[PDB]
């Protein structure tokens, strides 16, 4: 057929011309799928071989069934990503190859209970939660430091301020760092259509500060849209589990002290003011250590400031080279 070859050539030329266009946005998957094995891809053999929880950068538009995008991997080329509706269709295709999907079982009972698939056998039901396969995460993952104690106490503030200064100095002219005074742990997406749309309603949420949290959410989203690296200095993070189910999914950076004895003698080195809160500092430290390593993205366990600095610098250099 000439039409399929013509559309193949048109898509290839469009990709070649749009390889050097500004990036539009980014998304993150949560399902295991490959973009090359599908027959509906407009270009065969040049699909995306992604897995669960991967990041894609989209630049231009194709149709309601596919988009054009690249991976955040180093050297990743341009491929086609199935659309939200297309992914829903392929997911329905995933749960149709089985013998049955609805209520009528096939346990040696054929010919009596036909039971045509009701609304319970389609995607119409199961809307109690309805977790979307695709989520619009920020284009650049925010960098956040956690540990080794509560934010707002001398040891943690200095052990994070030194790293913040190193990041600012090493990446000067290519990084923006801002302190997020407002709360961030409530970065929800599916609470309601608009909780507190107006501040003059004088409601429970209208008079609250939740709208500030959401506004900071779009502020972070638009700053990540700028493609420059972002580092957060919000003093309301003490465990990645508090910001793991949200849409941001920030790069969790852990600075850990090797032993509780070292941490508490460090705390003793400050004075009586921190001796007063030493108890809660130790409690938060042990709770955060009990968090498993796979929860975090990078670890900083070296006792030398420098070694940790070049460790973080190398990781962010890899990220920068990967997304360009």
């Amino acid at each position: 057929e000439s039409a399929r070859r013509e559309v193949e050539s048109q898509a290839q030329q469009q990709l070649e011309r749009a390889k050097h266009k500004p990036v539009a946005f980014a998304v993150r998957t949560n399902v295991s799928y490959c973009g090359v094995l599908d027959e509906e891809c407009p270009v065969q053999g040049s699909g995306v071989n992604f897995e669960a929880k991967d990041f894609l950068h989209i630049k231009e538009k194709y149709s309601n069934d596919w988009w054009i995008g690249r991976l955040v991997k180093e050297g990743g080329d341009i491929a086609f990503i199935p659309s939200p509706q297309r992914l829903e269709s392929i997911r329905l295709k995933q749960e149709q190859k089985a013998r049955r999907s609805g209520n009528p079982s096939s346990l040696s009972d054929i010919g009596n209970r036909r039971s045509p698939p009701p609304s319970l056998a389609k995607q119409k039901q199961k809307q109690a939660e309805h977790v979307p396969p695709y989520d619009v995460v920020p284009s650049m993952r925010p960098v956040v430091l956690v540990g080794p104690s509560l934010k707002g106490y001398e040891v943690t503030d200095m052990m994070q301020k030194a790293l913040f200064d190193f990041l600012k100095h090493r990446f000067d002219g290519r990084i923006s760092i801002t302190r997020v005074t407002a709360d961030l742990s409530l970065a929800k997406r599916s609470v309601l259509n608009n909780p507190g749309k107006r501040t003059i309603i004088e409601r429970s949420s209208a008079r609250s500060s939740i709208a500030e949290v959401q506004s900071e959410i779009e502020r972070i989203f638009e700053l990540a849209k700028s493609l420059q690296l972002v580092v957060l200095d919000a003093d309301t993070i003490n465990h990645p589990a508090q910001l793991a189910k949200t849409s941001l999914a920030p790069i969790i950076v852990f600075v850990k002290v090797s032993s509780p004895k070292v941490l508490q003698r460090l705390i003793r080195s400050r004075g009586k003011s921190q001796m007063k809160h030493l108890t809660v500092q130790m409690m938060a430290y042990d709770k955060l250590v009990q968090c498993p390593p796979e929860s975090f993205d990078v670890i900083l366990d070296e006792n030398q400031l420098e070694d940790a600095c070049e460790h973080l610098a190398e990781y962010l250099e890899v990220y920068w080279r990967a997304t360009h």
Binding site: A162, L163, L266, N303
Partner: peptide
């Protein structure tokens, strides 16, 4: 470890 975790933590916010 204490030597590296005492000077470095007391120079930033400090």
């Amino acid at each position: 470890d204490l030597k590296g975790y005492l000077d470095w933590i007391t120079q930033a916010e400090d």
